[PDB]
Amino acid sequence: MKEFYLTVEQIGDSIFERYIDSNGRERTREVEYKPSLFAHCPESQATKYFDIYGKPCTRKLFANMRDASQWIKRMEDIGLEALGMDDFKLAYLSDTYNYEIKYDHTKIRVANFDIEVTSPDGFPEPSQAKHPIDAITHYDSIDDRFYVFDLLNSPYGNVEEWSIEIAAKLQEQGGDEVPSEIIDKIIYMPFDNEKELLMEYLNFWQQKTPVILTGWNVESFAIPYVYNRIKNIFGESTAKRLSPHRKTRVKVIENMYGSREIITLFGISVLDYIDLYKKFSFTNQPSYSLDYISEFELNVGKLKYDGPISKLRESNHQRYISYNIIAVYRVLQIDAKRQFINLSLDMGYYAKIQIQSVFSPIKTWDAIIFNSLKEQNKVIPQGRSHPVQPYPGAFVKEPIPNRYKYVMSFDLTSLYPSIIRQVNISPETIAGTFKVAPLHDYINAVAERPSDVYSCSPNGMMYYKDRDGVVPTEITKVFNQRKEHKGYMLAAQRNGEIIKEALHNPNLSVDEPLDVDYRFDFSDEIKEKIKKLSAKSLNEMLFRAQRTEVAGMTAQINRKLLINSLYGALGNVWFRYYDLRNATAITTFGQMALQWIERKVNEYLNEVCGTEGEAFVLYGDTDSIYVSADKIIDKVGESKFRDTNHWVDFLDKFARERMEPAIDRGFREMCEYMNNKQHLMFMDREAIAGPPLGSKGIGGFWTGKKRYALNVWDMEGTRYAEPKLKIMGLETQKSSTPKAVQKALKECIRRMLQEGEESLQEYFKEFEKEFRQLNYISIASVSSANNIAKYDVGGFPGPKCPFHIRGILTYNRAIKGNIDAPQVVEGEKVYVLPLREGNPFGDKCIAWPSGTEITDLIKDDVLHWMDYTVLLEKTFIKPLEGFTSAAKLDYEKKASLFDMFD
DNA sequence: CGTGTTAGCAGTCCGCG
DNA sequence: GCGGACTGCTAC
Ligand SMILES: Nc1ncnc2c1ncn2[C@H]1C[C@H](O)[C@@H](COP(=O)(O)OP(=O)(O)OP(=O)(O)O)O1
Ligand SMILES: [Ca+2]
Ligand SMILES: [Ca+2]
Ligand SMILES: [Ca+2]
Ligand SMILES: [Ca+2]
Ligand SMILES: [Ca+2]
Ligand SMILES: [Ca+2]
Ligand SMILES: [Ca+2]
C-alpha cells in the first residue's frame, strides 16, 4: 500500500513525523528538514520557478529551519518579499507525499477517553489537579476495546471491584444496563493505589499511543487533568511521556477568579468532540453536557443517579464505573451517526495538514492552494499585514409584512463559489478595472457594458477569461465532491418519504428489512416490495434511510462550509490571498444577480399572466427569491384542483417547464453582459408552499427580513408524505427560547398555516391555561454567560448589566458558602428565570448552568418565586403577537357587537 | 494563532411638565 | 411607559 502520514510537528530544526509505511506499520522518524524559500530575481536569469504573476524567482535552499526563519526577518528589514511556504511542516508534507493521499483509517489509532475525579471541595480544577484520578475509560479504535482503569483505594473511600455481570444486567434487575454489544469489548483493570494506576496508564499509553485523541471536553478537562496530576505525583518529565516526542506546551488562561490551562501534546492530534460537534453539526444547543447531546442525537435516556457526583463513587461505585464506560461509548455512538472523525480525516489528508487544522479554513486553504501551485513549479506570495476594513455583503429585500397564501421559492446553487467560477476570480487572474455605474444601472441593463474583452463584476473588477485561476480551479474540485454527497443525501431523503408513505398501510407479517443502498432512488421493483413489508421492517428501513441522509448531510454541508470559507478567507487579513477587490467582486456580483433576476421574474410572470407592473417576487435574501403564486393559482381557478397534491403538481410543472427556462434565459443574458468566462448561475425551484386545499390555512407569512414561516409540500424534489413547516428566524428556531415555548409557538404556527385563526385561538387558550403546570426547565430562557466579571461589582450588578448576567450574579450570592454548588463557567450557557418582587434572592431574575437541575438548596425557592406572568408575556405572547399582527390575524377573539348575544 | 456581512429582538439607560 | 441609542445575543 501507498504510505501516508499520521502526525507532523516542527521542534527546532527537526520535523517529527509519525506515519504508516508501505507494509502498513506505524513508524516515527526525525528529520533535519532543509526548507526552501524564494526571492524575485532578474528576467535575464533562467529559472524554473515563477511567482503567481509570472515573475521569475530564485530558490534559496537552507541548511536548517532557523536559518530560513532568520532569512525571512532579514528580508523584511531590507524591504523585499520572501516567497514560499513559511509553515515548514506543510512543505515537508508536500515534499514527502507528492501524490493524492489514499489513507486507511483502520491503521490510524483513534482514542476516545474520559476520566473521573471525586472532589468534595467543588470543581476539580485541572491546573491544580489536587484530587485523585479514580477512574479512566480509554477506548482504542485498533483493538476495538474499552480499557477500564479503576481505583479501589482513595482518601475519599475504599470500594469493592466493579462487576461486569451487574453492569450488563437491566436497570430493573438493579444493574447498569451497559449495552450488550460492548460487554465483550471491556478490559477491566482494578488498582490498590493511584500511583500504580497512573504508571500502568502511561505504560499502556506508550504501547497504544493515540494518533487522533478525542472524547467529550478532553481538551479543557481530561487531558490537562491527567497531565497535571501525573506532573504533581511523578514530576514534569514523566507527565511528558504523554507526548510520543516527549514535548509539551503549557498555556494558561486567566480572568479574575479561576485559572485554566490547555496542554499541547506534540505528536498527537487532539480533536475534542465538543469542538467537532460545534463546528460541523450545524446546531446551536441550549446545553452542551454529554447527557443532553446524546439525548438529542441518539434519543437515549439521561444517565440518572441518586445524590451528587462528588458522592457517587462512595455510595455506588458499581454505577460510577459503569457510567464512565457508557459516557465514552456515547461519543462513539454520536460519531457513528455524524461521522465527524471521518470528515476530519478526509479533509486533513486532502489538504495535507495536521488533522487538528481542519478547525481552520484558512490553514486548510493555504495548504490546498500551496500544493496546487507547487505542482506547477509556482511560488506562493509572502503573507502581508493588513488593517481590518469592513466591506459590503449580500442584498436582502424588505418584505411587506403579511400572510402569503401560495409561495414558490427559487434558489441559486452554491452561489458565491459559482460566482468565483463564473467570473474567474483569483489573485492571479486580475486583468484591471472599469469605471463603475451605480448598481441599479446594471440591475436594469441601462449601464454601459463593462468590457468586450474581460470577465467583469459590477464592483469594477475585470478578470482574464482565457486562463483558469488557482482559486476557481481548487474551489471547483471541492464543489464537485459536495454535489456528489448532496445527491446521496437528497436521494436518501426521497427514499425516506417513500417509506413514510408505506407506513400508512403496514402489512401483517414477519419479514426483514430490504438490502438496499439508500444513496440512490429506489427502483420500481424495490418500491413494490416496500408496499408489502411489515411495520417492524419498514421502520428499520426508515432508520437506515435517515442514517444514510445524516451521513450525506455531514459530508455535503461541511464541504459547502469549506468552499464558502474560501470566499470569507479573501476577506480575512490573515489569509495569504486576502483581497477586498476579490471579496467585493463576489458580493456585489451577488447583489446584482439576485436583483437582476427579480426583475426578470416579475417581467416574465406579468407577461404569462397577461398583467402589467405587479410584484410577484415578495422577498429575497442573497441567492434566493420567494414568488407569490396566488395569481398563477387564480389564473386557472382553485375549483379545478382535485386535492392539494394536484395543485402542487401543477406548480411543480409550471416552475420547471416555464419559469426555470425563463430564469435560465435571464441569467444567460446577464453572463453575456458581464462578459463572464462560464455561465454558472443555476437558479432552480426550491420550495412549493400553500395551505391544504379547502382549509382555512393561510399558507405562509413574513414579519420582516430573515423572519418567516411556510407550509411546504415539496422541497428540492422531495414530495413530503406530510407537510413540513419551514420556519426561519422566528423564536421557534432560537436556542434562547424555552423548549416548551418553541413547541407551543410552532403548533400555533402550524395551526395558522394549515388550519386557520379559529384553530389557533383554541390552542392559545389551552396553552395559557396549562402554562403554569410546565416543568421549570422547559420554560426557562437560555443564554451565554459572557463577560460575567465585567459586570460584577461586589457581587452585585454594575452599569448596563445584561439580564442574564444579573441572574448569574444573583445565583452566585445565593450559593455563597455552598462549597459544592455548581459554579457558572464564563462563556458557557445558563438557564434564566424571572423572579417575583420580594423574593429572598433580592433581585428580578436568577440563572444557573444549563442542562442541569438548579442546586437543591435553592431549587425550592426558585420554584416558589418564579414569575410565570412575566415568563408567559416575554417568551410566548410577545413573539406570538409579532406573528399574528404580521399575518393580520388574532390569537384572542377581539370584542364585537355579537358579545351582546347569548 | 485566526472564513465573511446582513439583520431582528431583548435589554439597560436616558429623556420626558 | 414608550421612543431612541446602545450592547449582547442569536440567516445568508
Ligand atoms: N457560513 C458561511 N460563510 C460565508 N458565506 C456564507 C455562509 N453561508 C452562506 N454564505 C453566503 C455564501 C453562499 O454561497 C450564499 C448563499 O448561501 P446559502 O443560501 O446557504 O446557499 P448556497 O447557494 O451557498 O448553497 P446551496 O447550494 O446549498 O444553495 O451566502
Ligand atoms: Ca463524568
Ligand atoms: Ca443557494
Ligand atoms: Ca438549492
Ligand atoms: Ca402496504
Ligand atoms: Ca439560500
Ligand atoms: Ca434547471
Ligand atoms: Ca434556601
Short mmCIF file of all heavy atoms in Angstrom, two decimals, chain A residues 71 177 323 413 499 704 781 817:
data_model
loop_
_atom_site.label_atom_id
_atom_site.label_comp_id
_atom_site.label_asym_id
_atom_site.label_seq_id
_atom_site.Cartn_x
_atom_site.Cartn_y
_atom_site.Cartn_z
N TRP A 71 16.16 34.32 7.77
CA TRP A 71 16.25 34.95 6.46
C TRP A 71 15.05 35.77 6.16
O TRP A 71 15.16 36.85 5.58
CB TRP A 71 16.42 33.90 5.37
CG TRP A 71 16.59 34.49 4.00
CD1 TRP A 71 17.73 35.11 3.47
CD2 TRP A 71 15.60 34.55 2.92
NE1 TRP A 71 17.51 35.53 2.18
CE2 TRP A 71 16.26 35.22 1.79
CE3 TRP A 71 14.28 34.12 2.78
CZ2 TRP A 71 15.61 35.44 0.58
CZ3 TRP A 71 13.64 34.35 1.55
CH2 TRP A 71 14.29 35.00 0.49
N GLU A 177 -27.25 -1.55 32.91
CA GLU A 177 -27.65 -1.60 31.50
C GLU A 177 -26.55 -1.13 30.55
O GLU A 177 -26.82 -0.39 29.60
CB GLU A 177 -28.94 -0.79 31.27
CG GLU A 177 -30.21 -1.61 31.18
CD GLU A 177 -31.46 -0.74 31.16
OE1 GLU A 177 -31.48 0.26 30.42
OE2 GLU A 177 -32.42 -1.07 31.89
N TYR A 323 -21.06 4.19 34.43
CA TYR A 323 -21.39 5.45 33.76
C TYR A 323 -20.18 6.07 33.09
O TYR A 323 -20.34 6.75 32.08
CB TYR A 323 -22.06 6.46 34.71
CG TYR A 323 -23.54 6.19 34.97
CD1 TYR A 323 -24.25 6.98 35.88
CD2 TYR A 323 -24.22 5.13 34.34
CE1 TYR A 323 -25.60 6.74 36.13
CE2 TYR A 323 -25.56 4.88 34.60
CZ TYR A 323 -26.24 5.69 35.49
OH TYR A 323 -27.57 5.46 35.76
N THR A 413 -27.76 27.75 -6.97
CA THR A 413 -26.91 26.69 -6.45
C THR A 413 -25.54 27.25 -6.05
O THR A 413 -24.93 28.00 -6.81
CB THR A 413 -26.72 25.57 -7.51
OG1 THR A 413 -27.98 24.93 -7.73
CG2 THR A 413 -25.68 24.52 -7.08
N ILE A 499 -40.95 5.45 2.32
CA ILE A 499 -41.15 4.57 3.46
C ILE A 499 -42.26 5.11 4.37
O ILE A 499 -43.19 4.39 4.72
CB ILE A 499 -39.83 4.34 4.25
CG1 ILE A 499 -38.80 3.64 3.35
CG2 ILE A 499 -40.10 3.51 5.50
CD1 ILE A 499 -37.37 3.70 3.84
N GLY A 704 -40.71 40.29 8.68
CA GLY A 704 -39.62 41.20 8.36
C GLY A 704 -38.50 40.43 7.66
O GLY A 704 -38.66 39.27 7.29
N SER A 781 -35.60 30.49 30.01
CA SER A 781 -34.86 31.01 28.86
C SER A 781 -33.44 30.49 28.95
O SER A 781 -33.05 29.94 29.99
CB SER A 781 -34.82 32.53 28.86
OG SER A 781 -36.12 33.05 28.62
N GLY A 817 -20.82 30.09 49.92
CA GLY A 817 -20.55 29.18 51.04
C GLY A 817 -21.13 27.78 50.90
O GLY A 817 -21.02 26.97 51.82
#
